[PDB]
Here is the input.
Amino acid sequence: MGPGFDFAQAIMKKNTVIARTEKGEFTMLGVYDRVAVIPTHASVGEIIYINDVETRVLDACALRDLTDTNLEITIVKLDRNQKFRDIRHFLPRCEDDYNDAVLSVHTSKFPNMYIPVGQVTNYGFLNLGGTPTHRILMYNFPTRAGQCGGVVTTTGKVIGIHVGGNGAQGFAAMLLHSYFTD
Ligand SMILES: CCn1ccc(CNC)n1
Here is the structure.
């Protein structure tokens, strides 16, 4: 409808795949080369389905901060025959608050979904499903099941991936440029 949705659509149409694990279908953001991210609770194994094609996982790393606290981001390298558009220059360098964000989802169940979630708070600590978690972003939208891995953007920035909700608020894990240096 507007420049927020324009940027979100541009990211969804080139930098997402549908990831299936034994724990469900997830929106999966490709970042560069064959490297993508997914919430850690997807429990990635040695094999994953990518757009319903059996795909070997070459590496998977569940990120934790330097206090050894869960970040809820898993970085996956896929044995795919094609690279993602490199979007690392759209990642923020530092923890921050944001205005006017969009949460975008693409699964079998929720294709072409875009939600204007509004103001995003640097919330920080969250007890996420019993697990102490750092670097959490919060937005005041009643997010539901199946939206996990959905991409949080502002105009010009890819800032996080949706990892949870409490029925009234939704929570995302930060994406930082420093996660994807090579
Ligand atoms: C079944 C109709 N419906 C309303 C919202 C949604 C998806 N959640 C954002 N689905």
Notes: Helices lie at 3-15. The chain has two domains: 1-15+85-182, 16-84. Residues 3-15 form the longest helix (13 residues).
